[PDB]
Coordinates of C-alpha atoms in Angstrom, one line a residue:
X1 CA 0.0 0.0 0.0
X2 CA 1.3 3.5 -0.9
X3 CA 2.6 5.5 2.1
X4 CA 2.4 9.2 2.6
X5 CA 4.7 11.3 4.7
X6 CA 4.4 8.9 7.6
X7 CA 1.4 6.5 7.3
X8 CA -0.6 4.0 5.2
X9 CA -2.9 5.8 2.7
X10 CA -4.3 2.9 0.9
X11 CA -6.7 4.0 -1.8
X12 CA -5.2 2.2 -4.8
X13 CA -5.6 1.0 -7.5
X14 CA -8.1 3.6 -8.6
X15 CA -6.4 6.5 -7.0
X16 CA -2.7 7.2 -7.6
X17 CA -0.1 10.0 -7.5
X18 CA -0.8 11.1 -3.9
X19 CA 0.1 14.5 -2.5
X20 CA -0.2 15.5 1.2
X21 CA -2.6 18.4 1.8
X22 CA -2.9 18.4 5.6
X23 CA -4.4 17.1 8.9
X24 CA -7.1 12.1 9.9
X25 CA -4.9 12.8 6.8
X26 CA -6.0 14.6 3.6
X27 CA -4.3 14.0 0.2
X28 CA -5.1 14.8 -3.3
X29 CA -4.9 11.9 -5.8
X30 CA -5.5 11.2 -9.4
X31 CA -8.8 9.4 -10.1
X32 CA -7.9 6.9 -12.8
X33 CA -11.6 6.2 -13.6
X34 CA -12.8 9.9 -14.1
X35 CA -9.3 11.1 -15.1
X36 CA -9.4 14.1 -12.7
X37 CA -7.6 14.9 -9.4
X38 CA -9.7 14.4 -6.3
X39 CA -9.5 15.0 -2.5
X40 CA -9.3 12.0 -0.2
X41 CA -9.7 12.1 3.6
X42 CA -8.5 9.1 5.7
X43 CA -10.7 8.7 8.8
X44 CA -9.8 6.3 11.7
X45 CA -12.7 6.7 14.1
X46 CA -13.6 3.3 15.5
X47 CA -11.8 3.5 18.8
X48 CA -13.9 6.4 20.0
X49 CA -17.6 6.8 20.5
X50 CA -17.6 10.5 19.6
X51 CA -15.7 10.0 16.3
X52 CA -18.0 7.2 15.3
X53 CA -20.9 9.5 15.8
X54 CA -19.5 12.4 13.9
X55 CA -18.3 10.2 11.0
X56 CA -21.7 8.5 10.7
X57 CA -23.5 11.7 10.9
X58 CA -21.5 13.2 8.2
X59 CA -21.7 10.2 5.9
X60 CA -25.5 9.7 6.3
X61 CA -26.1 13.5 5.6
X62 CA -23.7 13.9 2.7
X63 CA -25.0 10.8 1.0
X64 CA -28.6 11.9 1.2
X65 CA -28.0 15.6 0.2
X66 CA -27.5 16.5 -3.4
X67 CA -26.9 20.2 -4.1
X68 CA -24.4 22.3 -6.0
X69 CA -23.3 24.2 -2.9
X70 CA -22.8 21.2 -0.6
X71 CA -19.8 19.0 -1.0
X72 CA -20.8 15.5 -2.2
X73 CA -19.1 12.2 -1.5
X74 CA -17.9 10.7 -4.8
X75 CA -16.6 7.3 -3.3
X76 CA -15.9 5.7 0.0
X77 CA -13.0 3.1 0.3
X78 CA -13.0 0.6 3.1
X79 CA -12.2 -3.1 3.7
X80 CA -14.8 -5.7 2.5
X81 CA -15.6 -6.9 6.1
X82 CA -16.3 -5.2 9.3
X83 CA -13.4 -7.2 10.9
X84 CA -10.9 -5.9 8.4
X85 CA -12.2 -2.3 8.4
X86 CA -9.9 0.0 10.4
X87 CA -10.0 3.1 8.3
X88 CA -12.4 4.6 5.9
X89 CA -11.4 6.9 3.0
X90 CA -13.9 9.5 1.7
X91 CA -13.4 10.7 -1.8
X92 CA -14.6 14.3 -2.8
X93 CA -14.2 16.8 -5.5
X94 CA -10.8 18.6 -5.1
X95 CA -11.3 22.1 -4.2
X96 CA -8.6 24.8 -4.9
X97 CA -9.0 26.4 -1.4
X98 CA -11.4 27.4 1.4
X99 CA -12.7 30.7 2.7
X100 CA -10.4 30.6 5.8
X101 CA -7.3 30.3 3.7
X102 CA -8.5 32.9 1.1
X103 CA -9.3 35.5 3.8
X104 CA -5.9 35.1 5.3
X105 CA -4.2 36.5 2.2
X106 CA -6.8 37.9 -0.3
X107 CA -9.0 41.0 -0.2
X108 CA -12.4 40.1 -1.7
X109 CA -14.1 42.4 -4.3
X110 CA -17.7 43.5 -3.3
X111 CA -18.8 41.2 -6.2
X112 CA -17.0 38.2 -4.7
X113 CA -18.6 38.9 -1.3
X114 CA -22.0 39.0 -2.8
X115 CA -21.6 35.8 -4.9
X116 CA -20.0 33.9 -2.0
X117 CA -22.8 35.0 0.4
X118 CA -25.4 34.0 -2.2
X119 CA -23.9 30.5 -2.5
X120 CA -23.6 30.0 1.3
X121 CA -27.3 30.9 1.7
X122 CA -28.4 28.8 -1.4
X123 CA -26.7 25.7 0.2
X124 CA -28.1 26.6 3.7
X125 CA -31.7 26.9 2.2
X126 CA -31.4 23.3 1.1
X127 CA -29.9 22.1 4.4
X128 CA -32.6 23.8 6.4
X129 CA -35.3 22.6 4.1
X130 CA -34.2 19.0 5.1
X131 CA -34.9 20.1 8.7
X132 CA -31.2 19.9 9.3
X133 CA -28.9 22.4 11.2
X134 CA -25.2 22.5 10.2
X135 CA -24.2 24.2 13.5
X136 CA -20.5 24.7 12.7
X137 CA -20.5 27.1 9.7
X138 CA -17.2 29.0 9.6
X139 CA -14.8 30.0 6.8
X140 CA -12.8 26.8 6.9
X141 CA -16.0 24.8 6.2
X142 CA -16.7 26.7 3.0
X143 CA -14.7 25.2 0.1
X144 CA -13.9 27.0 -3.1
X145 CA -12.7 25.7 -6.5
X146 CA -10.6 27.7 -9.1
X147 CA -13.8 29.3 -10.5
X148 CA -15.0 30.4 -7.0
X149 CA -17.9 27.8 -6.9
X150 CA -18.5 27.4 -3.2
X151 CA -19.5 24.2 -1.3
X152 CA -20.4 23.8 2.4
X153 CA -18.6 20.9 4.1
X154 CA -18.3 19.3 7.5
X155 CA -21.6 18.0 8.9
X156 CA -20.0 16.3 11.9
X157 CA -21.9 18.6 14.3
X158 CA -25.2 18.8 12.4
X159 CA -28.5 17.8 14.0
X160 CA -32.1 17.6 13.1
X161 CA -33.8 20.9 14.1
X162 CA -35.7 20.5 17.4
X163 CA -37.1 23.9 18.5
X164 CA -39.4 22.6 21.2
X165 CA -36.4 21.4 23.0
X166 CA -34.0 24.3 22.5
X167 CA -34.1 25.8 26.0
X168 CA -31.3 25.3 28.5
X169 CA -29.7 27.1 31.5
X170 CA -27.1 29.8 31.5
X171 CA -23.4 29.0 30.6
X172 CA -24.3 25.4 29.2
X173 CA -21.3 23.9 27.5
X174 CA -21.3 23.9 23.8
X175 CA -19.2 22.1 21.1
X176 CA -19.3 24.3 17.9
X177 CA -16.5 26.9 17.0
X178 CA -16.6 29.7 19.5
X179 CA -16.2 32.9 17.3
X180 CA -19.3 31.9 15.2
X181 CA -21.7 31.0 18.1
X182 CA -24.9 33.0 18.4
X183 CA -25.3 34.9 21.7
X184 CA -28.2 32.7 22.9
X185 CA -25.9 29.7 23.1
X186 CA -24.2 31.3 26.1
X187 CA -27.5 32.3 27.6
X188 CA -30.3 29.8 27.1
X189 CA -30.1 27.8 23.9
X190 CA -28.8 24.3 22.9
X191 CA -28.4 25.4 19.2
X192 CA -31.4 23.3 18.0
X193 CA -33.0 26.0 15.8
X194 CA -32.2 27.3 12.3
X195 CA -31.4 30.8 13.7
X196 CA -28.1 29.6 15.0
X197 CA -26.8 29.0 11.5
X198 CA -28.0 32.4 10.3
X199 CA -25.9 34.0 13.1
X200 CA -22.8 32.1 11.9
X201 CA -23.4 33.2 8.3
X202 CA -23.7 36.9 9.5
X203 CA -20.3 36.5 11.3
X204 CA -18.9 35.0 8.0
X205 CA -20.3 38.1 6.0
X206 CA -18.6 40.4 8.5
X207 CA -15.4 38.5 8.2
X208 CA -15.6 38.7 4.3
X209 CA -16.0 42.5 4.6
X210 CA -12.9 43.1 6.7
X211 CA -10.8 39.8 6.6
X212 CA -10.9 39.7 10.4
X213 CA -13.3 37.7 12.6
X214 CA -15.9 40.1 13.9
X215 CA -16.3 38.5 17.4
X216 CA -13.0 36.8 18.2
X217 CA -13.8 35.7 21.9
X218 CA -11.0 34.0 23.7
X219 CA -13.2 31.9 25.9
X220 CA -16.6 30.9 26.6
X221 CA -18.2 34.0 28.2
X222 CA -15.7 36.4 26.4
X223 CA -17.6 35.6 23.2
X224 CA -20.8 37.1 24.6
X225 CA -19.1 40.3 25.5
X226 CA -17.5 40.7 22.1
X227 CA -21.1 40.4 20.7
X228 CA -22.5 42.9 23.1
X229 CA -19.6 45.4 22.5
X230 CA -20.9 45.8 19.0
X231 CA -24.6 45.2 19.1
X232 CA -24.9 47.2 22.4
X233 CA -27.2 46.3 25.3
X234 CA -30.2 44.3 24.4
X235 CA -33.6 45.9 24.6
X236 CA -36.2 45.4 27.3
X237 CA -38.3 43.5 24.9
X238 CA -35.4 41.2 23.9
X239 CA -34.5 40.6 27.6
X240 CA -38.1 39.9 28.4
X241 CA -37.8 37.0 25.9
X242 CA -35.2 35.3 28.1
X243 CA -37.2 33.8 31.0
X244 CA -34.2 32.0 32.7
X245 CA -33.3 34.3 35.7
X246 CA -29.5 33.5 35.8
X247 CA -29.1 34.5 32.1
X248 CA -31.3 37.6 32.3
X249 CA -29.8 38.8 35.5
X250 CA -26.3 38.4 34.0
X251 CA -27.3 40.7 31.2
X252 CA -28.9 43.1 33.6
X253 CA -25.7 43.3 35.6
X254 CA -23.6 44.6 32.6
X255 CA -23.1 48.4 32.2
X256 CA -25.0 49.9 29.4
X257 CA -23.3 49.7 26.0
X258 CA -24.5 51.5 22.8
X259 CA -24.5 50.0 19.3
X260 CA -21.4 50.4 17.1
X261 CA -22.8 51.4 13.7
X262 CA -22.0 48.9 11.0
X263 CA -20.8 51.6 8.7
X264 CA -18.2 52.7 11.2
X265 CA -16.9 49.2 11.5
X266 CA -17.1 48.6 7.7
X267 CA -16.7 52.0 6.0
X268 CA -15.9 50.4 2.6
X269 CA -18.9 48.0 2.6
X270 CA -22.0 48.2 0.3
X271 CA -24.8 49.7 2.3
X272 CA -27.2 46.8 1.2
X273 CA -24.6 44.3 2.5
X274 CA -24.7 46.1 5.9
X275 CA -28.5 46.1 6.0
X276 CA -28.5 42.3 5.5
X277 CA -25.6 41.9 8.0
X278 CA -27.6 43.7 10.6
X279 CA -30.6 41.4 10.0
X280 CA -28.4 38.3 10.3
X281 CA -26.7 39.5 13.5
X282 CA -29.8 40.4 15.3
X283 CA -29.6 39.5 19.1
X284 CA -33.1 38.1 19.4
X285 CA -33.2 34.8 17.5
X286 CA -36.9 35.1 16.9
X287 CA -36.4 38.4 15.1
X288 CA -33.3 37.2 13.1
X289 CA -33.8 36.9 9.3
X290 CA -34.4 33.3 8.0
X291 CA -32.5 31.9 5.1
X292 CA -35.2 32.4 2.4
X293 CA -35.7 36.0 3.5
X294 CA -32.0 36.6 3.3
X295 CA -31.9 35.2 -0.3
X296 CA -34.6 37.7 -1.2
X297 CA -32.7 40.7 0.3
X298 CA -31.8 43.6 -2.2
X299 CA -28.1 42.9 -1.6
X300 CA -28.6 39.6 -3.4
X301 CA -30.9 40.8 -6.3
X302 CA -28.4 40.0 -8.9
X303 CA -28.6 36.3 -8.1
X304 CA -31.9 35.6 -6.4
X305 CA -34.1 33.2 -8.3
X306 CA -36.1 30.9 -5.9
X307 CA -36.9 28.5 -8.7
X308 CA -33.1 27.9 -9.0
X309 CA -32.6 27.5 -5.2
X310 CA -33.8 24.0 -4.7
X311 CA -35.0 22.3 -1.5
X312 CA -34.6 18.8 -0.2
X313 CA -37.2 16.1 -1.4
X314 CA -37.9 14.9 2.1
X315 CA -37.1 16.0 5.7
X316 CA -34.6 14.1 8.0
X317 CA -37.7 13.6 10.4
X318 CA -35.8 11.7 13.1
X319 CA -32.6 12.9 14.8
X320 CA -30.2 10.1 14.2
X321 CA -30.4 8.3 17.6
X322 CA -26.6 8.3 17.7
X323 CA -26.0 9.9 21.1
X324 CA -26.4 6.8 23.2
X325 CA -25.3 4.1 20.8
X326 CA -22.2 2.0 21.5
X327 CA -19.2 2.4 19.1
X328 CA -19.7 -1.3 18.0
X329 CA -23.2 -0.6 16.7
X330 CA -21.8 2.6 15.2
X331 CA -19.0 0.8 13.3
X332 CA -21.7 -1.6 12.0
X333 CA -23.9 1.4 10.8
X334 CA -20.9 3.0 9.1
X335 CA -20.1 -0.3 7.4
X336 CA -23.7 -0.5 6.2
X337 CA -23.9 3.2 5.2
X338 CA -20.8 2.8 3.0
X339 CA -21.8 -0.5 1.3
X340 CA -23.1 1.1 -1.9
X341 CA -19.5 1.9 -3.0
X342 CA -18.2 -1.7 -2.9
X343 CA -17.2 -3.2 -6.3
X344 CA -20.1 -4.8 -8.3
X345 CA -22.7 -3.7 -5.7

């Protein structure tokens, strides 16, 4: 089996000419069947409950979804038996770069900002129409090819939406990337509603406009005070929406802060972009714009066409009952979920 800078990366015979991309391990390879270079991620999850869950979740979701702005799975390579299966390789379209890498060194034209935002929201419309929440949208999970076609990846933290069960106490621990978390996560929300993805997209828009994250909190509660430093103190009405006393009293304890106008923070931005930014970064999740409304905002008029913004054929009605499932059953489900890619299936 071919080796790569360290370890076994065993994806032959179909894929050859491997080149390390990064850290399981990612390489590009030449696809001898389709005659194109592809991306291959090696995953070794079976020791650990939590990796089994994230890998299963991602595979089941990406296999069901079919949308131009969500990364597909082209192929999955694994041993023919559950006993021999130690690693799984996932094959996907090779993408030139991602929005994290691009923002580190490239300034974006207003036209690029608008087109990228349009594609993020078009993919998100489809994801939310399947009653799924991504929950970890951030620049590194937005892949871009050489012609700036954008695809959302990494559904390891995604869940089926469950708004009746979203309430929780103050300071409840959370798993998704801190700088893109909506303020209610720190106050009273489990992140089981579609509004927590819109907040992340708003933070992504802000980051496109300036190349710097807008709320770069250094720890759990710091993230909330970054948010409030910009949006200012929440209104009476918005506090009245938070019934939990620990969370509301914490907000009441803070000195009053006024709003920093978006046009002072982003003095080169298109005014329509800032109007839509303001609606995505709205403190109260019930007042926050939804994905279809965002698509219809004037900033996106050059692109909006709801007949070309497709939705999923069927909801993911169940949440994958993966939380309390042993790794042995999980390995078995992964083996079954990947079966369709075995030779002469």
